[PDB]
């Protein structure tokens, strides 16, 4: 009566909710590595790099604590096109790349994939689809020095726009084309590689910024960066809230007869979800399948007559699942309807609270698979008899006898047909 949003319910079978079994554990399977990641050596250097030639530092096989970041270089922006500021310490990362370089005061937001120009086409280029974040902070005095440190050399222009995550350590003699030249002279043979450099009191916009990007990647190979490891032991025959290198799911862990290749990690199905996973330790392939699934339908004779109801668990074996209640795990609750009366195993599903008499009548409430239900005696309860097709008859047939009616009956019946419904108009 909550599902129909009323207080009186007519006699019939109604889909009400779905039987779902919650798990009881939250085991985590983080990989076994206890090293420490090098962000201290990444950030506490003296000279980082130039803009055209940035360092590429691989971070792998270490526990990463992403909470302690503001104690090294404060006043960042964190500019995260991907994993959230407070979510990098949750899932495993296959490869983390720490690239640090300096740009003055204007392209710390033009490093985005959308923006392009004299930096994204001639210096560090972020790809159009990209996961990862960048850290930028003030360098008004600590990286300004007297008349500049002179490490502000930028490519200015080149012939072709460079691919993302690509650097070019070379010089050019670009001309745009008239009497082609290779000499150092400026006129018609303009030299690339200009720079900045100033006293720290300057025109505000040229004051440099040390930008340290942080590009990550998931899936791929077996993961190396894991963050805080909270590994828990295994159970292979019950539903759990597993956590395998980033994915979180509810289902019954199960041993496998699979033929996973050593390089293959995940196992997918026709849907986007994953049904097989490889644990980081012991290299054991485990199949993923959820718990008991089917919906529950309530059969009632109507609140105008009685208040007893019989529920039917659709598409589940009655002799195995339900029966065992195991309370504080069933989301539908109302667990009192498991041993109130006798059970029956129907092709439609397990029937709770209906006694199977084996008489045959023209049935009242259609349940399915040739079995109906009604509110009769054998004292008034719900029975689950088999459908009756009608009276069994056998007219005698012989090849010399005929039957001729000696009377008749003028019978008048009614037939009702809809013709036209309500007309509606909407504005």
């Amino acid at each position: 009566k909550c599902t129909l949003k009323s207080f009186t319910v007519e006699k019939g079978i109604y889909q009400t909710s779905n039987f779902r079994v919650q798990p009881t554990e939250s085991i985590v399977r983080f990989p076994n590595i206890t090293n420490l990641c090098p962000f201290d050596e990444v950030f506490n250097a003296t000279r980082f790099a130039s803009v055209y030639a940035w360092n590429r530092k691989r971070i792998s096989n270490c526990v990463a604590d992403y909470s302690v970041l503001y104690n090294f270089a404060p006043f960042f922006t964190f500019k995260c096109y991907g994993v959230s500021p407070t979510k990098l310490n949750d899932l495993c990362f296959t490869n983390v790349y720490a690239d640090s370089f300096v740009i003055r005061g204007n392209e710390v937001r033009q490093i985005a994939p959308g923006q392009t120009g004299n930096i994204a086409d001639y210096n560090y280029k972020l790809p159009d689809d990209f996961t990862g974040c960048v850290i930028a902070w003030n360098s008004n005095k600590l990286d300004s020095k007297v008349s500049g440190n002179y490490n502000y050399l930028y490519r200015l222009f080149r012939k072709s726009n460079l691919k993302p995550f690509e650097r070019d350590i070379s010089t050019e003699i670009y001309q745009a084309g008239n009497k082609p030249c290779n000499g150092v002279a400026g006129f018609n043979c303009y030299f690339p590689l200009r720079s900045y450099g100033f006293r720290p009191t300057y025109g505000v916009g040229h004051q440099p910024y040390r930008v340290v990007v942080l590009s990550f990647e998931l899936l791929h190979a077996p993961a190396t960066v894991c963050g805080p490891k909270k590994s828990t032991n295994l159970v292979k025959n019950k539903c759990v809230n597993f956590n395998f290198n980033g994915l979180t799911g509810t289902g019954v862990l199960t041993e496998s007869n699979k033929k996973f290749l050593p390089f293959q990690q995940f196992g997918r199905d026709i849907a986007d979800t994953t049904d097989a996973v490889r644990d980081p330790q012991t290299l054991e392939i485990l199949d993923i399948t959820p718990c008991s699934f089917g919906g529950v339908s309530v059969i009632t004779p109507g609140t105008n007559t009685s208040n007893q109801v019989a529920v039917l668990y659709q598409g589940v074996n009655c002799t195995e699942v339900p029966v065992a209640i195991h309370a504080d795990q069933l989301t539908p609750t109302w667990r009192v309807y498991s041993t109130g009366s006798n059970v029956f195993q129907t092709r439609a599903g397990c029937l709770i609270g209906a006694e199977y008499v084996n008489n045959s009548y023209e049935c009242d409430i259609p349940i399915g698979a040739g079995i109906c239900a009604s509110y009769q005696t054998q004292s008034q309860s719900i029975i689950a008899y088999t459908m009756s097709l009608g009276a069994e008859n056998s007219v005698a047939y012989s090849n010399n006898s005929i039957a001729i009616p000696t009377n008749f009956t003028i019978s008048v019946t009614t037939e009702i047909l809809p013709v036209s419904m309500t007309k509606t108009s909407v504005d």
Binding site: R56, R58, N95, F165, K259, F260, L261, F263, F266, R268
Partner: protein
């Protein structure tokens, strides 16, 4: 000759069984021409320019047929010099090293001997002068050999090299069946490792040495002449291949959607 049905691999490291999944990653097109690139090296002191320059049009398929360890390594670079860090592969007897570093010219030792020096030695030192060299791949060698019995038993090696957003990948598998000119045997191809350098490559080179040159003919004729001369080189193109898995989980067969209208059906 024509690459009939080779060049299919696993686009992702995901186990799928009896699925007709499609993909978008680039492959070698079906029934496409390849190169022979025969190397004679008759130990007479002469040179025939058997290691040309290939333009590296977004990925190269490499197929070789050797005896045990004839081929060794490939060179990837933009200017083939120390201006850019060039990727270098050297294969040892019990190891492999894969390393990218600014190398000027790959050396070649004195190699003029065919049959008198049955025991092969006095080799290597192919690598150039050392510079700021990156992290290498000292690891187990990938090439394997089976003892041939009653002749006609050699292993063909299929190698796929590609670059997606700078990332460098390798696909390799060995098929020990027969010694012919790209047979129609359909088989999957397994990726092994991902190389995280993220540098650009515009030209491709190899470092084959021919200390043992047995039954190797030589001809300067250029034309459509099919034959298992020395090896094969193929080119990758952006395609839309459709792959079929089986119950055990192996790619039994695959078709594309741009070769034939029947393929499109």
């Amino acid at each position: 000759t024509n690459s009939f049905t080779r060049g299919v691999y696993y686009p992702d490291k995901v186990f799928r069984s009896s699925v007709l999944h499609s993909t978008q990653d680039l492959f070698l097109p079906f029934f496409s021409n390849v190169t022979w690139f025969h190397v004679i090296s008759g130990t007479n002191g002469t040179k025939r320019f058997d290691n040309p320059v290939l333009p590296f049009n977004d990925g190269v398929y490499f197929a070789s047929i050797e005896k045990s360890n004839i081929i060794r390594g490939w060179i990837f670079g933009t200017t083939l010099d120390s201006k850019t860090q060039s990727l270098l592969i050297v294969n040892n007897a019990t190891n492999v090293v894969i390393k990218v570093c600014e190398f000027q010219f790959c050396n070649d030792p004195f190699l003029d001997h065919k049959n008198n020096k049955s025991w092969m030695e006095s080799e290597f030192r192919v690598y150039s002068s050392a510079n700021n060299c990156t992290f290498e791949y000292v690891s187990q060698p990938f090439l394997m050999d089976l003892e041939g019995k009653q002749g006609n038993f050699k292993n063909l090696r299929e190698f796929v090299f590609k670059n997606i957003d700078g990332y460098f990948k390798i696909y390799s598998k060995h098929t020990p069946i027969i010694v012919r000119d790209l047979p129609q045997g359909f088989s999957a191809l397994e990726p092994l490792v991902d190389l995280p350098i993220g540098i650009n490559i515009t030209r491709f080179q190899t470092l084959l040495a021919l200390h043992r040159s047995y039954l190797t003919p030589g001809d300067s004729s250029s034309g459509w002449t099919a034959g298992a001369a020395a090896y094969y080189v193929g080119y990758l193109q952006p395609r839309t291949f459709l792959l079929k898995y089986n119950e055990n989980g192996t790619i039994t067969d695959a078709v594309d959607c741009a070769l034939d209208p029947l393929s499109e059906t």
